[PDB]
């Protein structure tokens, strides 16, 4: 239940223990339009984003060539119903998964949810998802039809600390407050 | 595996630090020179920065990996004056053997290294100068002369000096919730072959080094409210699908399909307004007639690092795809930012369109002309490291003389700490003083000249500033000629270095020896 | 001293090297090169490029060549020796005074200011747009190849470029000379040269059928029998009589084309497509059914048939440009029928030079005695201060004057004179009656510049030396060289 944040620079006095959830990745950092995020639902997505590519053999016949771009246009409407489901439930704070496996994600994704003001997050262990229910409370969503108010968290502020080059997300406040919570401390050193 | 124990392996330790560090003390001081490494891969890049050289140079024996990281973690405190920094804990392993040797116990070296340090705390704030101080016209031309030394180019400081100072006035910027900061490694350092550093410009914004692609469109755009849009959308012939794949005149209706629509996504960049376009691949000439009937500057081959600090610096939001909330392909008016001043000026058979006045993130690059690439290699590393020390100027208005002038005074204050601890710790002190005494006597070794004579006059003249309090004077003085070999106040000189750079050094400098001084053998495990 | 050993060995047998290289006496040196061949020629530009040695300090000075030929773009000829020139007057100093490097660059610095002040005193102004001097003027940069022969008519090719492709924008005479096309052509004479308006190409006709002539062309640059019959018909819409293409020609699209009675082209490389869309006015076509009416050949005279005995190459005639000036992008060629690759691939080299040579002759009009006599000059100026200044400095200050007077020594060398008397005279003569006194070309004697009719512009001279001097403290600020490094 205590993880330790493992961070270049600084000095040991600048160690301080977080009263609330901790993320060691950053965002894709393409788009970086959002620099703050306050009074926002926090979620964890088990699942990934990205078109529909099943396991087995997929054979589209395409009879048209307006069909093409079409099913680029059916590959942004699918993954943008997601984000509107999402942005009616008012989270702007997202938790992705590994996202190295299989289905990882398109470059049309920033897009959407920069219009949105929504904050992702991904290359998340599993392991990581676990420790981050217990202090934070928020039920992870595994598909869009289970996603509802419900599940989502919520928290105070939320703000990026931005040390020596090194950025590092720190969450303030927890909403529904749970029997198994969780604390993490983030070690300021010159090396490893 | 090889395992040995004993003395074996700090003498072999020590050994290697200092045949690798006598080498790079030929560049200690304004006197010091570059010099050429090897790499036996064709690459070689001649340079007095020890961050780079440590990094490049092999590590024979794995403890002398713990100098390299140390010249990584200067670069991320300060970075400039390498060539006097990480060769003072060079020095400390030096005397360390004589001391083993001794019935003294390695953490009772350690222990008087850090009582050492943390009273010499106190004794830079006896010699502290202040923000004001001693006259500081501007306070930056000053330290602008110091910044010369050390480096090749201090033949130049009539120039840099003024170049220097005036660009980072305008990097003043509010961030870090109110704070006053220039944000470092946001100014952008152009070179340019031909004439000397007297052509260089100062632009007090950003400057992008870049052309138009077709000689036919407009290479002048005059005003103000100029927008720019950076698009990094790559415009090119589809590929297929996942390999499921597909009458050639519809086959070949996709290629004229999609580029219609590319035209068509032109239109919606002209309906904008933005006088500046990017694009970061490359294109036909299809595409780029169409730019040319646009009346919008374009240009291709774009990085996309250089694109980043645009959007940053504009306020513009960097488009890499055409999308809105519906299934439309178009190009918000949202996404386009203002800037005072944007002009293209012709500089060394070329042209560089010229950003100021950005309201969103304020910034300043500097586009400087010399003789060739490997006269600006020893240029460029070291005006990027002169970046920090006018940061650390303006942050904190605390320096101190330079020229062997700080390790000459830490000599008198440890001569009275040494009696003051006393018992086994005395001996320590005694070796810490005078291994910060071989800093200042390797400057002279550089210049041909006697250090020790010079030492022992100035000592003495900062040993009568300290066995007086009350002092007009008659006594007090400091400073070190390496020119006339002579003492002469600092102020008529004008080398000042910041304090949190010296104060910065010896922190790392505790650790670095330290970390020696705890390694009772070492093993070597074979690879598969 | 362990480090310097290996920096000064380094660039010392480069100067043996380039030794041959100066002057119009100057020879050739034989080298095998890695990739099996041999490179024989005069011109160390190529050779300083493609020269392997082991000491990597060397090889930084390789590329100062071709740092001065991109800034300037002269020296070939004669400085090409000083950027190594210096560094040999510089071997008695750590090996015997045993001082830093620094002392050098603060008596560098005062041998450079008086080195500019020199070469300004015998400055004099000449007429650009007057043939009278520039006539001699070309040909003294390059009559030190093979082109003698033929001087007579290569300074009529450069003489006319000069005045045709460079216009102006107003500052000078700058223009982009690479996108001046020359063709080089080997075997025949040069008598058949001329300036044409439009490109030539090597590339053979691809169908047996069509006849080449035109009178006003019309330039288009680019199941499966009826699909590319109609692509046929969408590039003959506009009644082409001129197809090229990149790629290569079907048999199927001989057949098709022949009805439109145009040419068609193959293997045609980017390079030279770029520049038939501006000569020809046409512009490139990616996509096939792009072509409009707006690539229509514009100001092409006429066409004709230029033919080896072996295969068929592409000739377009001489034009015009109706007037009824924009001199930044400029459309026209040289065509170079050349009589053997030895001779033609100097002529290449002498008239980008002498483009080159004649481009810093109109950015900067003052004149200076050429042919060795400046470099004495100084050196007569440059040893009299040495006297005067009489202080520790004197001593890399004053070696600099052996430097200057080594320049016309190598041009002594390759022509066999003795060196002896004549620089004795030299320095006399110049220090009394004038600084116009100079070595002949080829009798080696005390005759002047002026009455001998070679000269050299001032921006030569000093652009030249300032670079060479600066360039020579590289190798000075190195104090060590560590090898075995492994990046």
Request: proline share 3%; net charge neutral; aromatic share 4%.
């Amino acid at each position: 239940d205590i993880r330790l944040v493992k961070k270049v620079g600084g000095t040991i006095d600048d160690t301080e223990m977080i009263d609330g959830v901790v993320l060691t990745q950053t965002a894709i950092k393409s788009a970086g339009g959002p620099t703050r995020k306050e009074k926002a639902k926090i979620g964890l997505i088990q699942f990934q984003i990205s078109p529909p590519k099943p396991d087995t053999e997929n054979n589209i016949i395409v009879n048209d060539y307006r069909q093409m771009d079409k099913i680029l246009k059916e590959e942004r409407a699918y993954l943008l119903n997601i984000c509107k489901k999402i942005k009616k439930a008012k989270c702007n704070v997202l938790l992705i998964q590994k996202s190295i496996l299989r289905d990882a994600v398109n470059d049309l994704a920033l897009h959407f949810l920069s219009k949105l003001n929504i904050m992702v997050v991904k290359d998340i262990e599993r392991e990581e998802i676990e420790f981050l229910s217990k202090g934070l409370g928020c039920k992870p969503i595994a598909d869009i039809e289970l996603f509802t108010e419900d599940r989502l968290g919520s928290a105070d502020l939320v703000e990026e600390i931005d040390s020596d080059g090194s950025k590092i997300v720190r969450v303030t406040g927890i909403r529904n407050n749970n029997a198994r919570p969780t604390v993490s401390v983030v070690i300021r050193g010159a090396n490893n | 595996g090889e395992k040995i124990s004993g003395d074996d392996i700090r003498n072999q330790n020590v050994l290697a630090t200092m045949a690798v560090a006598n080498v790079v003390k030929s560049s200690l001081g304004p006197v010091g020179l570059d010099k050429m490494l090897v790499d036996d891969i064709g690459d070689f890049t001649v340079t007095n920065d020890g961050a780079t050289i440590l990094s490049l140079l092999d590590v024979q024996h794995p403890a002398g990996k713990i100098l390299v990281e140390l010249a990584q973690q200067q670069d991320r405190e300060i970075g400039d004056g390498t060539t006097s920094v990480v060769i003072i804990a060079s020095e400390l392993l030096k005397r360390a053997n004589e001391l083993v040797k001794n019935k003294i116990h390695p953490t009772t070296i350690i222990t008087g290294f850090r009582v050492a340090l943390r009273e010499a705390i106190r004794f830079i704030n006896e010699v502290l100068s202040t923000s004001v101080d001693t006259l500081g016209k501007e306070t930056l031309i000053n330290i602008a002369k110091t910044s010369m030394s050390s480096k090749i180019i201090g033949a130049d400081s009539d120039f840099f000096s003024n170049m220097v100072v005036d660009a980072l006035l305008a990097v003043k910027t509010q961030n870090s919730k109110g704070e006053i900061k220039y944000p470092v490694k946001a100014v952008n350092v152009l070179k340019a072959h031909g004439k000397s550093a007297t052509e260089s410009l100062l632009v007090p914004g950003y400057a992008l080094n870049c052309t138009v692609a077709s000689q036919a469109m407009p290479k002048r755009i005059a005003g103000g409210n100029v927008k720019i849009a950076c698009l990094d959308l790559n415009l090119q012939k589809a590929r297929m699908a996942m390999g499921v794949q597909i009458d050639p005149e519809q086959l070949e209706q996709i290629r004229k399909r999609e580029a219609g629509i590319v035209l068509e996504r032109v239109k919606k960049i002209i309906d904008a307004g933005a006088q500046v376009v990017l694009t970061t691949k490359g294109i036909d000439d299809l595409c780029l007639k169409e730019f040319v009937e646009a009346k919008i500057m374009g240009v291709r081959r774009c990085k996309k690092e250089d694109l980043r600090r645009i959007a940053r610096a504009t306020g513009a939001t960097l488009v890499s795809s055409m999308s809105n909330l519906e299934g439309e392909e178009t190009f918000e008016s949202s996404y386009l930012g203002l800037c005072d001043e944007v002009v293209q000026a012709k500089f060394s058979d070329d042209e560089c369109i010229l950003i100021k006045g950005t309201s969103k993130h304020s910034s300043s690059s500097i586009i400087l002309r010399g003789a060739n690439d490997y006269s600006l290699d020893e240029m460029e590393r070291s005006l990027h490291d002169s970046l920090s020390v006018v940061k650390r100027t303006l942050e904190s208005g605390n320096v101190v003389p330079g020229g062997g002038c700080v390790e000459a005074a830490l000599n008198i204050y440890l001569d009275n700490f040494a009696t003051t601890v006393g018992s086994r710790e005395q001996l320590a002190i005694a070796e810490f003083a005078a291994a910060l005494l071989i800093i200042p006597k390797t400057l002279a070794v550089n210049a041909a000249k006697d250090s020790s004579e010079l030492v022992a006059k100035l000592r003495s003249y900062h040993a009568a500033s300290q066995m007086a309090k009350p002092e007009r004077r008659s006594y007090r003085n400091y400073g070190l000629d390496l020119i006339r070999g002579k003492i002469v106040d600092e102020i008529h000189a004008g080398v000042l270095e910041p304090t949190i750079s010296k104060v910065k050094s010896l922190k790392s400098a505790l650790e670095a020896c330290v970390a020696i001084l705890r390694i009772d053998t070492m093993i070597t495990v074979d690879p598969e | 001293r362990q480090a310097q050993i290996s920096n000064i060995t380094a660039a010392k047998a480069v100067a043996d090297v380039i030794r041959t290289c100066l002057g119009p006496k100057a020879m050739l040196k034989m080298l095998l090169d890695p990739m099996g061949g041999l490179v024989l020629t005069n011109d160390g530009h190529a050779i300083l490029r493609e020269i392997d040695v082991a000491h990597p300090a060397a090889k930084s000075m390789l590329e100062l060549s071709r740092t001065q030929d991109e800034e300037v773009g002269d020296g070939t000829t004669t400085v090409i020796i000083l950027a190594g020139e210096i560094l040999a007057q510089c071997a008695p100093y750590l090996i015997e005074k045993n001082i830093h490097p620094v002392i050098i660059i603060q008596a560098l610095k005062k041998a450079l200011t008086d080195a500019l002040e020199v070469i300004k005193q015998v400055s004099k102004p000449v007429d650009v747009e007057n043939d009278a001097a520039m006539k001699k003027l070309i040909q003294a940069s390059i009559g030190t190849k093979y082109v003698i022969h033929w001087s007579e008519k290569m300074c009529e090719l450069a003489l006319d470029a000069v005045k045709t492709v460079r216009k102006d924008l107003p500052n000078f005479e700058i223009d982009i000379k690479r996108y001046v096309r020359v063709e080089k052509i080997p075997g025949g004479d040069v008598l058949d040269s001329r300036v044409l308006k439009g490109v030539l190409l090597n590339k053979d006709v691809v169908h047996p059928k069509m006849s080449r002539h035109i009178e006003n062309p019309r330039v288009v640059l680019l199941i499966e029998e009826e699909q590319v019959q109609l692509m046929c018909e969408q590039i003959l819409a506009v009644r082409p009589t001129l197809v090229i293409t990149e790629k290569g020609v079907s048999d199927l699209a001989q057949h098709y084309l022949l009805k439109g009675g145009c040419s068609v082209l193959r293997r045609v490389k980017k390079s030279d497509n770029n520049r038939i869309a501006r000569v020809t006015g046409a512009t490139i076509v990616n996509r096939v059914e792009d072509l409009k009416e707006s690539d229509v050949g514009t100001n092409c005279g006429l066409f004709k048939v230029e033919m080896i005995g072996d295969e068929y190459f592409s000739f377009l005639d001489n034009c015009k440009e109706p007037l009824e000036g924009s001199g930044l992008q400029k459309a026209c060629t040289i065509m170079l029928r050349g009589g053997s690759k030895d001779i033609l691939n100097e002529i290449d080299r002498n008239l980008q030079d002498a483009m080159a040579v004649a481009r810093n002759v109109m950015l900067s009009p003052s004149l200076s005695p050429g042919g060795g006599a400046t470099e004495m000059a100084v050196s007569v100026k440059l040893a009299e201060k040495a006297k005067q200044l009489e202080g520790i400095q004197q001593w890399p200050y004053q070696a600099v004057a052996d430097a200057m007077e080594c320049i016309p020594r190598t041009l002594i060398q390759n022509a066999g004179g003795d060196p002896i008397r004549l620089l004795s005279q030299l320095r006399a003569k110049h220090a009394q009656g004038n600084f116009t006194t100079g070595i002949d070309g080829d009798k080696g004697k005390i005759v002047d510049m002026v009455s001998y009719g070679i000269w050299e512009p001032e921006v030569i001279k000093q652009q030249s030396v300032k670079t060479a001097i600066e360039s020579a403290c590289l190798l000075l600020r190195v104090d060590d060289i560590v090898s075995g490094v492994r990046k």
